[PDB]
């Protein structure tokens, strides 16, 4: 999750706090996840062979 979020605290009331992100340090981006090819489409073939029964 590339953002390098900072750590800011906001006071609510008696002996309590509400912790949020204050600012984004660096370059903003999005959350993403790799899945390598020749490992999922080959494995999808493994499911359909047993699903061909």
């Amino acid at each position: 999750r590339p953002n390098n979020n900072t750590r800011k605290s906001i006071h609510i009331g008696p002996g309590r706090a509400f912790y949020t992100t204050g600012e984004i340090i660096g370059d903003i981006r999005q959350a993403h996840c790799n899945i390598s090819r020749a490992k999922w489409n080959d494995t999808l073939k493994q499911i359909v062979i047993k699903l061909r029964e």
Partner: antibody, heavy 132, light 105 residues
Framework: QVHLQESGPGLVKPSETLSLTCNVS????????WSWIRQPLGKQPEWIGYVHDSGDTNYNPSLKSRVHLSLDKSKNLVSLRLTGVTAADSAIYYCATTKHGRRIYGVVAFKEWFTYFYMDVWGKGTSVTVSS | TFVSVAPGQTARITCGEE??????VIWYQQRPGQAPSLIIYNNNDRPSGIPDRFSGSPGSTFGTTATLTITSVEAGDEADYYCHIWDSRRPTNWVFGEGTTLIVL
């Protein structure tokens, strides 16, 4: 080598249409990006915008409604038009080349990257004075 | 600002605001009575025709400022320098940065 020469009227009355002519030699105007830079005396240069024949052209939002750019393929020259000139426009025009660069810091998809522009070859420049 | 340095020494020029996002800083050198020319792109890359004496700080350490460092400054290097800012979090600058004048003694 690419050599650029600019010509103009020099003295322009207020509220008139100012036109420039940028002679281009040694290269074709279709294969390169072109931009115009206006530099006030004693101040930093100010960028107007970059133009191309393919339509990938953007302008300064401060001067979007008053500037017009055109290309002459037959005569191999670049012209600029500006209407509603004021006394704050008394500066020096420049006709310079523009090359595009790609900055890729992140995923190549998802439209995170931003492109940049730099000036390679500059013209000699011409002096434009606006007065009544 | 104003910078004074002896000939043959190393001088540093600081231009622009503190770093907020990724930087691609463009530098120019303008002699008096002349026009600026291509000096630095991509904060450390130069086109053919100029030596390696011109160096620039990379745009990696966030919270800092872009810096121009020149080694063994000679008498002909006395010219106006202007910095251009490209940032991923700041809008595209249509005006160049404030100039810095260096003095060679």
């Amino acid at each position: 080598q690419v050599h650029l020469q600019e010509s103009g009227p020099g003295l322009v009355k207020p509220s008139e249409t100012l036109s420039l002519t940028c002679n281009v030699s040694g290269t074709l105007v279709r294969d390169n990006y072109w931009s115009w830079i206006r530099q006030p005396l004693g101040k930093q240069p100010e960028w107007i915008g970059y133009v191309h024949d393919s339509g990938d052209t953007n302008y300064n939002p401060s001067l979007k409604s008053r500037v017009h750019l055109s290309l002459d393929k037959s005569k191999n020259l670049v012209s600029l038009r500006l209407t509603g000139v004021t006394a704050a426009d008394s500066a020096i025009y420049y006709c310079a080349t523009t090359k595009h660069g790609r900055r890729i810091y992140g995923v190549v998809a998802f439209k995170e990257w931003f492109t940049y522009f730099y000036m390679d070859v500059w013209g000699k420049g011409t002096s434009v004075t606006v007065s009544s | 600002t104003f910078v004074s340095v002896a000939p043959g020494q190393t001088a540093r020029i600081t231009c622009g605001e503190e770093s907020l996002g990724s930087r691609s800083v463009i530098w120019y050198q303008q002699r008096p009575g002349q026009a600026p020319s291509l000096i630095i792109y991509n904060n450390n890359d130069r086109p053919s025709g100029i030596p390696d004496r011109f160096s620039g700080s990379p745009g990696s350490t966030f919270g800092t400022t872009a810096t121009l460092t020149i080694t063994s400054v000679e008498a002909g290097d006395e010219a106006d320098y202007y910095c251009h800012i490209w940032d991923s979090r700041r809008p595209t600058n249509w005006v160049f940065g404030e100039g810095t004048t260096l003095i060679v003694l």
